[PDB]
Amino acid sequence: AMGQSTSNHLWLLSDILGQGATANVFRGRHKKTGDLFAIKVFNNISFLRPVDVQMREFEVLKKLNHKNIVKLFAIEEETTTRHKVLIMEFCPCGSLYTVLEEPSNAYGLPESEFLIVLRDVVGGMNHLRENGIVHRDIKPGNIMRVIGEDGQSVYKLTDFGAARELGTEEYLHPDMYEGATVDLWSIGVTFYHAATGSLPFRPFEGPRRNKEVMYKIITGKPSGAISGVQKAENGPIDWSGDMPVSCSLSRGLQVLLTPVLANILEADQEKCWGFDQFFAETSDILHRMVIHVFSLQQMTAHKIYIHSYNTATIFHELVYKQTKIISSNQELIYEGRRLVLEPGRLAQHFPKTTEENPIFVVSREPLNTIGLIYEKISLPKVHPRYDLDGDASMAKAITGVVCYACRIASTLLLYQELMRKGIRWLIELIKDDYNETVHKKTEVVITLDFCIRNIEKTVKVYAAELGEISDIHTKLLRLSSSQGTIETSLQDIDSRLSPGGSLADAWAHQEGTHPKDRNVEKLQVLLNCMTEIYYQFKKDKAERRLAYNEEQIHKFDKQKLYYHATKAMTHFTDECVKKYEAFLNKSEEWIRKMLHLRKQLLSLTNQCFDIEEEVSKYQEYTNELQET
Amino acid sequence: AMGQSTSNHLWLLSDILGQGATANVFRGRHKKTGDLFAIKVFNNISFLRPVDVQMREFEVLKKLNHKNIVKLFAIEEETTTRHKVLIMEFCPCGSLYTVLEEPSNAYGLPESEFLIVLRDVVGGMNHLRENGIVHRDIKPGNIMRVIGEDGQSVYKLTDFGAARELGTEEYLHPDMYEGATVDLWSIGVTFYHAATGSLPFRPFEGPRRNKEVMYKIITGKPSGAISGVQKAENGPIDWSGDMPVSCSLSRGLQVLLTPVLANILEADQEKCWGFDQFFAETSDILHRMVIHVFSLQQMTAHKIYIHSYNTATIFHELVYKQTKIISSNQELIYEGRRLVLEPGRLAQHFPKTTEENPIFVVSREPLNTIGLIYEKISLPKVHPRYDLDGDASMAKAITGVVCYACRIASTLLLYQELMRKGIRWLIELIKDDYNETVHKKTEVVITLDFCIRNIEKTVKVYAAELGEISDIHTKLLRLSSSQGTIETSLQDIDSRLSPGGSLADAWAHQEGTHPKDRNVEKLQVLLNCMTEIYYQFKKDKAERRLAYNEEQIHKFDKQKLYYHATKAMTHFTDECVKKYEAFLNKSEEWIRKMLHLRKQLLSLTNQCFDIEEEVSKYQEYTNELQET
């Protein structure tokens, strides 16, 4: 139907993307080439119209080019309305706000995707700072996303510099709600929003006429608390200076992210960081590499963030901070074999590690099995009301919960599959410790056999001599007798290491769940049914009203949305969770029996060294008698 | 707009799925529940209308229920036209024909997906045979697909039994073109179509008035050839009794599939199988499990199909058929350690193996490095004609080629990453062979030291005796001297096994490509751009004509379709292929240097056994002298 146009570009008023106060962004094309661009047709531009100041201004933003900033190609004039149009690069993937709309990110972005957001935001914001222009309005809605040539997302900035001639209410600064601190505030609110999937400070009702509580929360700013939420109407505020349990981020990352957000979120410029302090600590986090470590003792996977130039001493220290294992007790296993790490080895030369192929950690000291620690979340109540707005928010909520449960279910299967490997390697690795003890026993056996034979031969060939021989003959029997006790007790350990020897890993190949069950795929099917319904309810909300036929379809599917969710949740707790807790219960059992056998094998091996020094004082005794 | 209806169901004439001769399939809903169903409204049903025969007939097909057969729920009558309507289950995923439309399957379905098709088709066709009804018209267009609760596809049959009151031209039987053999013919044409992505017998022009050549090809039926294609107009026919190189299937599967298709594709019922012979051999293939084996010698991955009750002897034989390695020369490695397999061990108890974590095979005998063998396919010419039909076929073709190149590029990266592991394990596994040779040397050293000491002591304490001692003293030096040669030559092997010792795997961590390069992700980006354009050209073909604006957009994108393809192909050959061939060239080098060191370590170890029997004839000689 009706559609605006320009000398070089044209678009339809239907194709609408963003609706701002001063302008509107449409999907447009170039009349000649046909490439897609973003058209910013300015609305209500008369009482200003500074064709002198804005001329050089937009020419300055024109040549401004960066990978983390939306490029402004040209400033043209509309054909009819003569409105000045900005031609920008079209960002096919929407904004960060669109990503947070996704239920998969209802409880926070994936850790990898979160690192992309943090890096691009800092790089773009730092590029704007070097030019002096201040933003203050940074929000996931004005942070666009594109797909780079390598497939990884790339985030860019755009809606800035409009405060010359003229923050979002949830991203406003306490003193600015009614200095460069106003910048970092919205940034921290944004970063918390990408990690948690929710806003830092939330009243019970929300941002409305009852948002009076909010201003008290923001002005409260207690200590280095990063969030504060009241769970009841006009009730107390639940404060916390740490991340929620539902956060999809790894524990190692939260330790580094918590201080950053705590120092940039407060009204006082006294303790608040500057752009240099912020850029210093943030870029420090980005430069670090990833170390994947699975602690068999606790059945917990860990991601330790270390710089590439650091040594293995700082590595053991950070591992202690997360696993609570003494640096001298941390023992590493990789690809079926143990790996010895020098205290001064750089992180650049570490082996290749992934979350599905990490470095296992075994400890001499007993440690409790913790397992995965996640937030148990149930389904919300589904009201029969036809409210399109309510059915849309209810769709995002109920689907995000199932996304989390499926995310946890995917993590539970990983822990079990990693456990089965870490055990299969350990039993074969401790078996190698048994193979070397046999070698050290044969050294004492060969030493025993020949040394005693010479002294038992010396009596057959060639009061005084008899007294010496007897004392020696007894001593040789003191050790050969204990040599027979160890010889048979090791066959008992070998009987334990043998299949069916009460230490086998057969239990682990039975109790838990396996990728053969396809429990994660089963949950993803129902989750797709719900996700399709969610994006459909968004489409019905945009229309504000539906026809009669569309009205009852919306109600039928809304009833199937509940049935899909319950069917998955039941399959999640009655199959995945229960079979995991049974695999974790029998996991403690085998740990006790393994550490017990490892303590026995230790002593029996050290006893071979205890008798190794005793046979060196006798083989060199009579055989080395002195005479002219 | 206009839309038919029924007592219990209603649908729009816009929502159309399949267009047949006797009926039309629409997307319909149930008036009460709102669940989706397939509506088969019969067109032109007057000169027949057997409400006596079809009544009991459709009631028989009603109760007919199977997992591999489209369920017929009810037979109702249209409101206005009074046409008899069939209510069937809606299959959301289309037909097998729709899957083959996808460029990813232009050269054949994935191996896993192919096994699903074969199993479901046989199960459904066997269920129809047990009821006596014959099909003859089996085609990927009448084989629907659904997604099961576990996420895996499920294929079902439908368009059968319509030959009572009344084969596709490309699926027709030679004698039926102008017995139960007419069945298996279309089945074989279907199975070849799913593996290759193309039809078995193809004239140059195609199925037209020049299809006269086709009938000569079908009636030719030379031997057990499964395909025959002329590459030039009215030219000779290129016959082949094997699968094409572009086939995505594994070599082990082709060996089993080739005889099946060859015996069911011929006009003669003399050599053609029956439904029992077909069901016997097919079900035999489905019952077998998968054994993933990566031969480091040839740098080739293999999938050996074996029944679970078979022994490791049949396993070595099949491995010999693919890798050409003698059963006694096949040596297995798994998870960093070698694994010894008893000749009678069942396949049920084999370790867990995947294509990304297989069982490596090393051989004593030298073998050439073959690498991946794939079909080099270039891009086709893009004509400037506006033909919507031509732009659609050209889109499927050019995108399928890039899908193949990206598939190969994904396989090349796997081979390299598997190679790096298989080498890192081997160097540490042969290092263990060096650790046990040190142990066997210390056994001869301890034997040497004490045995010679007793004879060098016997001369200090206690013509005839001197003659014996001297001959013994020399003999002890004959072995201790060679014991010094081996001792130092092993340190040279240890110098080779040490980092930088000319045998290190540092070259492999440099020459080839890595997942860090994200070369597969780079190709997938451009491949999505092309796939989106392809499905758009399908949409433009369905309209038969486009508006002026849609007309030039179709031409702009058609020009970008070529630029995307060339950009990927250049990045495929100039980055992925070249860096792979360089990794394969230096792969031969390290193989020669590894097998050379393995031959040295062998002899030096056997020499310790050669001197182990020499020191047993001397330590028991003088020390065991006889006297009263």
Ligand SMILES: O=C(NCC1=CC1)c1ccc2[nH]c(Nc3cc(CN4CCN(C(=O)CC(F)(F)F)CC4)ccn3)nc2c1
């Ligand atoms: O505000 C901006 N600058 C202000 C400044 C001072 C500087 C700005 C600038 C650049 C942008 N690039 C975009 N891309 C975008 C893309 C989508 C996704 N979407 C794209 C294609 N789809 C359609 O077209 C649908 C229809 F209806 F059109 F057919 C479907 C999905 C959604 C929202 N945005 N938004 C931008 C906003």
Ligand SMILES: O=C(NCC1=CC1)c1ccc2[nH]c(Nc3cc(CN4CCN(C(=O)CC(F)(F)F)CC4)ccn3)nc2c1
């Ligand atoms: O011939 C049959 N029986 C003959 C017999 C004697 C017995 C038969 C029987 C059952 C079937 N189930 C289907 N499903 C189906 C589904 C699609 C995919 N598709 C579905 C939903 N989409 C639309 O609806 C588009 C629109 F336009 F509708 F909005 C979009 C994509 C395409 C084709 N088919 N086909 C069937 C055919």
